[PDB]
């Protein structure tokens, strides 16, 4: 009688629908049951939810994250020299989306990694570029790349140095009064 | 009137001026006998000479250093994945001056590259210039901009202080092609 149907790959998240194979990828791309992990670095939070639930999750459970508005902002990371492994996290709203800016300090001497991810898909992220600048007297260091999508996350890119990477000596060249300004410009491409 | 005279600090390099102590500093700041070390990295050439002897030295003794003439050039450093300590050097001619571009690969579980530009000239001359180093890859760009160091300052202190373009062997793979790394060097007047 009927042909063989496939479960949606998000059946374990509650997705009841079964589909012919040709329709399966189309459906999973749009499935509201698709789970996303909390994108706030790094280990604490075990929340999972839908893509449209991520920004509300951040607003309700991570109140220390600020959200600036605009495509060209300044990310002031304060107290870059106070001891340990440390994270700074900020959201940036522009182009109808929210981008998360992360600066992570790792101990090795210390080094810093700065990266941007979009609360959105890879196909959406590929329409943007982000630029991180450090500005100092007669000095400028700039990184430009495509934002990571939250499904991809940022840990892999940081492991690969595929982001702005700089040491304590660099941070000191650019810091003022113990704080480091990072200019962040999101553009369409 | 009566006076105790002192030799210029560059007497050993040929300066025969002797002067009262109060005017010694004023002379030495403009004295043409001031020696400069060979600016070519890292440690093997011991030559020293006056500023006007530096370009003839590089041309006589360091013939494998290539020069490109232009304000906006591509420095192609070949074989960037060679292990250990490695230097690449070339000269860029523009605005009436010569600039030395250096890429240094150093080796703690961290090989890192340092790229920096020095003017064959004085600090005062270098202050009129800016340089931009850009690495370009697929949907990626890493840029450093700064004032070139003068050859009297050298580049060792800047490299020690990461006051230059600094990148590891992992991020280099984003920019390398065929095992080589193109660095765009643009010099401008400010
Ligand atoms: Cl300075
Ligand atoms: Cl500018
Ligand atoms: Cl001196
Ligand atoms: Zn589904
Ligand atoms: Zn969370
Ligand atoms: Zn003299
Ligand atoms: Zn020499």
Numbering used by the authors:
A (entry chain A): 91 to 198, 202 to 282
B (entry chain B): 91 to 197, 200 to 282
What does the paper say about this structure?
Siah1 (seven-in-absentia homologue 1) is an E3 ligase belonging to the RING (really interesting new gene) domain family. It acts as a scaffolding protein and interacts with a variety of different substrates for ubiquitination and subsequent degradation. Siah1 functions in Ras, DNA-damage and hypoxia signalling pathways, and is implicated in various cancers.
Two isomorphous crystal structures of Siah1 were determined at 1.95 and 1.58 Å resolution. The electron-density map was very well defined in the 1.58 Å resolution structure, apart from one loop region (Tyr199–Gly201 in chain A and Lys198–Tyr199 in chain B), and these residues were excluded from the model. A Ramachandran plot shows that 97.4% of the residues in the high-resolution structure are located in the most favoured region, with no outliers. Superposition of the two new structures on each other gives r.m.s.d. values of 0.80 and 4.89 Å for chains A (175 Cα atoms) and B (164 Cα atoms), respectively. The notable conformational flexibility of the N-terminal zinc-finger subdomain may contribute to its role in the biological function by adapting its position to assist in interactions with distinct substrate proteins.
